């Protein structure tokens, strides 16, 4: 029916689900607004997917993010990964694929840990 | 040949004086291609 997309995002044990759909521009983490996200010093670590590329790309979508597990910094990395690749997948499916790889170029030039988590560790020396 | 042609994805094609030996190695007009150790 309504155009939606669901993406994930994982730090150590925290897991973030992101439902991105066409909307009016509201970004919610467990119903809380995006501004009211603890521990208040990594609010910009949460902000940087919606801040690197400008809010005009967020004007037509609305995002709801569930988070489980992990501590504080793991939850904020999971949130920002889910937000980022949800925006990328929405632009891959429903709008400009040129805007998709523009966004992918921006996020990968900043840090690709905002798009792909670094899973397979450790090393037996 | 028959077992690995059916176990694959890409297609596999399959007295007088001489059979003329068209697939020859060693040829830049070479006669003593041996090493001096080998001599």
């Amino acid at each position: 029916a309504v155009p939606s997309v669901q993406t994930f995002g994982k730090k150590k044990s925290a897991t973030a689900v992101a439902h991105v759909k066409a909307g009016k521009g509201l970004i919610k983490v467990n119903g809380s607004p995006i501004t009211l996200v603890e521990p208040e010093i990594l609010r910009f670590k949460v902000y940087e997917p919606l801040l690197l590329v400008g809010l005009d790309k967020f004007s037509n979508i609305d995002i709801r993010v569930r988070v489980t597990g992990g501590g504080h910094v793991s939850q904020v990395y999971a949130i920002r990964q889910a937000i980022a690749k949800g925006l990328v997948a929405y632009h891959q499916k429903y709008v400009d694929e040129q805007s998709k790889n523009e966004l992918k170029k921006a996020f990968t030039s900043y840090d690709r840990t905002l798009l792909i988590a670094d899973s397979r560790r450790p090393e037996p020396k | 040949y028959k077992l690995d042609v059916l176990s694959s994805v890409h297609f596999v094609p399959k007295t007088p004086t001489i059979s003329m030996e068209d697939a020859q190695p060693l040829y830049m007009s070479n006669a003593s291609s041996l090493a001096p150790q080998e001599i």
């Binding site: 009016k24 010093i41 801040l51 809010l55 005009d56 | -």
Partner: protein, 213 residues
């Protein structure tokens, strides 16, 4: 003259974002207060060994800078400073506390001497990094040493270590917190005023290197 119009409806989204944040979307500043550009490593020989060309928001990038050899000389200098600042037996792991206390530190660095505190801490590093030392060579097990020179990675690392442990030792049993103690240590190191712990230890080490040269 000339214009470029990219946006055609202003930013009015349903979760109303703070205005300083949607002003920071035009250009990235550290902590939404300090622009990383017009900040230069005044010295040579530490340029491309103190990362300042890649701006960040907070000093908590979670990259991997210890698996290869020299790639800890590419994570930015502010969180290099805060990772050395977290190191003591009482307070390991607490890098969020470390981030917020260097936030208060470089904030009062700005409100005392206002150019920008990232420039203050960059030329503090360039002035504190020692340029020679010695090595305790054997020599028959005598009192024997020989002056050598210092590679710039060791210079930057030893400067950061000297600044952080000097702030800790000057804030051990005083009224001042580690925040303002690191602030005054960085200001004295930026002037090179021969007063702070790191510049004193640097000139001492170069003095004994010149003596035993």
């Amino acid at each position: 003259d000339f214009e470029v119009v990219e946006e055609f409806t202003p930013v009015v989204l349903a979760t109303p974002i703070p205005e300083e944040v949607q002003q920071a979307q035009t250009e990235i500043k550290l902590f939404n207060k300090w622009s990383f550009e017009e900040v230069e490593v005044k010295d040579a020989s530490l340029v491309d060994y103190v990362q300042v060309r890649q701006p960040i928001f907070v000093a908590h990038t979670a990259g991997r800078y210890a698996n290869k050899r020299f790639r800890k000389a590419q994570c930015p200098i502010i969180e290099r400073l805060t990772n050395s600042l977290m190191m003591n037996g009482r307070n390991n792991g607490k890098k969020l506390k470390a981030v917020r206390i260097i936030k208060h530190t470089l904030d009062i660095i700005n409100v005392l001497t206002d150019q920008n505190p990232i420039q203050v801490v960059v030329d503090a590093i360039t002035n504190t990094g020692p340029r020679e030392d010695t090595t305790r060579v054997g020599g028959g097990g005598a009192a024997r040493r020989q002056a050598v020179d210092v590679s710039p990675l060791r210079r930057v690392n030893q400067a950061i270590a000297l600044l952080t442990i000097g702030a800790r030792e000057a804030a051990f049993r005083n009224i001042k917190t580690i925040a303002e103690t690191l602030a005054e240590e960085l200001i004295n190191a930026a002037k090179g005023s021969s007063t702070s712990y790191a510049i004193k230890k640097k000139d001492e080490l170069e003095r004994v290197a010149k003596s035993n040269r």
